[PDB]
Design a protein around this ligand. Structure first.
Ligand SMILES: COc1c(CN2CCC[C@H](n3cc(C)c(=O)[nH]c3=O)C2)ccc(C(=O)O)c1Oc1cccc(Cl)c1
Ligand SMILES: COc1c(CN2CCC[C@H](n3cc(C)c(=O)[nH]c3=O)C2)ccc(C(=O)O)c1Oc1cccc(Cl)c1
Lengths: 197, 198
């Protein structure tokens, strides 16, 4: 089994990359694609609160992302890993660190303490970071707003801080390349990891 | 202003005590009494999720209590303290520490880290602990309204004892084994003594 998370800002080609990698990995592995809350009832109810809300306090929002994360982990990720599956998870702890911690200004270490309470030691076996420049990412967003551009840049700044501080489970993939190449580099990185157990 | 929380297991007479004490304090102070989620919409929605929880993971439950706590703090407690009010809050961080941390077995320090993220430095000025023995508490439970329940009740008390031993300075322990008229009087006097020193 393997718990593989995918991280990156919007415009990193993350959706395309996960779908294409899933289609190739399913040939050799029992694999699932998921994201939080991912159909878990309590997580879906939490997601409705976060969305069908207005000017929610950023720490309340962070705790709700963390609660949805735990429900998804316990009821969906862990049972799939127990079945021997390769779980491809679109966004996990690092999204809260970059978005809530860095971009929203709560502080990465404070948000880390919150998310370590939520995941209780269940860090990914491997994390693919789709390393897109702010400029390429901006173009992909318009293809697929001053405050939005700055928030997009802050998210990237946050991910850079996170990866600089920890580089073991993290594998950075050049997401400025055409998506065919991003898919190939991501697939090869995953296979290299999986074939080592 | 003053932020006063009330803590204790079930059977400590906490409901009766806070209501009576509040009724007395309003004569002399600008005071409000509240509890979580206390009508705050997001908090009420969180409460529904917790109550509808089928064998909910204890850490998810702890994060939901913490999220309800922050909504209630931000929308109700902090604005009242900014107006110079005395805020009487029925259950706060120490309920999560005793119930989620100690009794449920997550660990007090882990639940403290979670709740410190939620309250962001807003600890109570004073915490009234209604110190009832497990035996008196057990009897009040059977009067007001099994083995697993008795053990959980004892564990909650044990947790509160550990918490107060580690943070004696913030707590004022009131003998809750006394008849409730006396518990009300001792609680009221402890609060007045604190308030008249501000
Ligand atoms: C409000 O956050 C959402 C967004 C906004 N945004 C997109 C970029 C990622 C971002 N995000 C995502 C995660 C996982 C996290 O921990 N922190 C974040 O800030 C969330 C977009 C769609 C949905 C959406 O799902 O429609 C969404 O709601 C969610 C998504 C995941 C979990 C929860 Cl509780 C709510
Ligand atoms: C499931 O917890 C509840 C209980 C059970 N129990 C009673 C003893 C106190 C206990 N409790 C209370 C708080 C504040 C906390 O942080 N942790 C706890 O374990 C909660 C009783 C009534 C309600 C009730 O409100 O009907 C309730 O729901 C709540 C209470 C406060 C906050 C939230 Cl999110 C749900």
């Amino acid at each position: 089994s393997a718990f593989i998370t995918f991280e990156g800002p919007e415009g990193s080609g993350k959706t395309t990359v996960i779908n294409e990698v899933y289609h190739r990995l399913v040939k050799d592995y029992d694999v699932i694609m998921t994201r939080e809350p991912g159909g878990v009832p309590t997580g879906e109810e939490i997601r409705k609160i976060v969305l069908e809300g207005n000017d929610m306090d950023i720490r309340t929002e962070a705790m709700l992302f963390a609660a949805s994360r735990r429900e998804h982990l316990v009821l969906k990720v862990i049972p799939a890993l127990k079945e021997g599956k390769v779980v491809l998870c679109d966004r996990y702890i690092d999204s809260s660190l970059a978005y809530q911690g860095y971009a929203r200004g709560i502080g990465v270490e404070e948000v880390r303490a919150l998310n370590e309470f939520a995941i209780n030691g269940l860090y990914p076996d491997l994390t693919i970071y789709l390393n897109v420049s702010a400029e390429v990412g901006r173009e992909r967003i318009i293809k697929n707003d001053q405050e939005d551009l700055k928030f997009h840049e802050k998210v990237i700044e946050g991910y850079q801080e996170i990866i600089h501080n920890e580089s073991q489970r993290f594998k950075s993939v050049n997401a400025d390349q055409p998506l065919e190449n991003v898919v190939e580099d991501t697939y090869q990185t995953i296979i290299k990891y999986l074939e080592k157990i």
